[PDB]
Amino acid sequence: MQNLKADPEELFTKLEKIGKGSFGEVFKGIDNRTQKVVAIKIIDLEEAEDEIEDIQQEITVLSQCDSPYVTKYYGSYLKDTKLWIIMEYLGGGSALDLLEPGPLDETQIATILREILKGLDYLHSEKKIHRDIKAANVLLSEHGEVKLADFGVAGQLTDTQIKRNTFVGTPFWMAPEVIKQSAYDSKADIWSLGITAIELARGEPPHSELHPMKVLFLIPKNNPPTLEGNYSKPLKEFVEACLNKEPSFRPTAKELLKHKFILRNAKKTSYLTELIDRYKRWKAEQS
Numbered sequence: 001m002q003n004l005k006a007d008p009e010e011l012f013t014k015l016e017k018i019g020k021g022s023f024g025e026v027f028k029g030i031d032n033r034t035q036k037v038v039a040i041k042i043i044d045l046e047e048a049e050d051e052i053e054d055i056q057q058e059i060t061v062l063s064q065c066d067s068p069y070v071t072k073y074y075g076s077y078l079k080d081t082k083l084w085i086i087m088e089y090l091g092g093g094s095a096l097d098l099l100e101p102g103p104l105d106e107t108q109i110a111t112i113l114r115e116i117l118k119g120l121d122y123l124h125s126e127k128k129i130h131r132d133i134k135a136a137n138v139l140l141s142e143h144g145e146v147k148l149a150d151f152g153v154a155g156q157l158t159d160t161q162i163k164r165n166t167f168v169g170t171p172f173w174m175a176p177e178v179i180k181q182s183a184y185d186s187k188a189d190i191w192s193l194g195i196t197a198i199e200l201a202r203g204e205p206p207h208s209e210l211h212p213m214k215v216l217f218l219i220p221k222n223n224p225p226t227l228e229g230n231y232s233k234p235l236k237e238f239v240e241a242c243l244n245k246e247p248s249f250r251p252t253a254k255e256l257l258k259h260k261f262i263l264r265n266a267k268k269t270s271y272l273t274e275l276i277d278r279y280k281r282w283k284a285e286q287s
């Protein structure tokens, strides 16, 4: 943290709570210079213990990313016993939220997948592995732009460390080599993307009704999941390409951006505003 800043309230105004993050709460805020809205993740360092390792990793990684497909980072500010991590505000909800009212259509699935793939291509080109790709960590602006979020367990490859081995992620989305703690790389995110495609198509990842400890033996043992149901052949084949138990046979993000499913079905991100509006209507009438 060679660039930690101080006195954040002199540049930002903290508003209301808009959620809970991995390490504390998330608040809406305002940049007093531009009047744009921002998101502020506030972490009580007193409370943080061994999490500090990951909190430190989260900031490092956010600070090193500059992509329209990754939540922008404004800075980290020290305040009493609190660290304020100030980020891009995205008011459209997560892709998981957007699935709550009902199924997506294939154009929406492809559009969201294309944007996630652009974010993965960026991260992977920077030798970063997200490690927690799932619909909950794909956030949308109110006009439909899609960005990856939640870098708390991200991994960084370097010239001397070409693979990672840490067990991290969310069980249902974890690649088999991550569960086995084998040496893995960005291909683990391609498996998670395949699971996320099934999640965007069906609403939930494979084995979602099982206790997570159970999936830790099911994923390495069983054949890989496939997309079942009445879905187009290119979507089913997209899922199959990602969900190969041999990582080296999974395509890269750059290769998947050329997949027939994406080319035939992805449209402008602005049309995703219809899904954002569907969620707002559904949330408003939810009893």
Ligand SMILES: Nc1ncnc2[nH]cnc12
Pocket: 018, 019, 026, 039, 071, 087, 088, 089, 090, 091, 139, 149
């Ligand atoms: N949880 C969140 N809600 C809104 N915008 C965000 N930007 C980063 N995390 C966010």
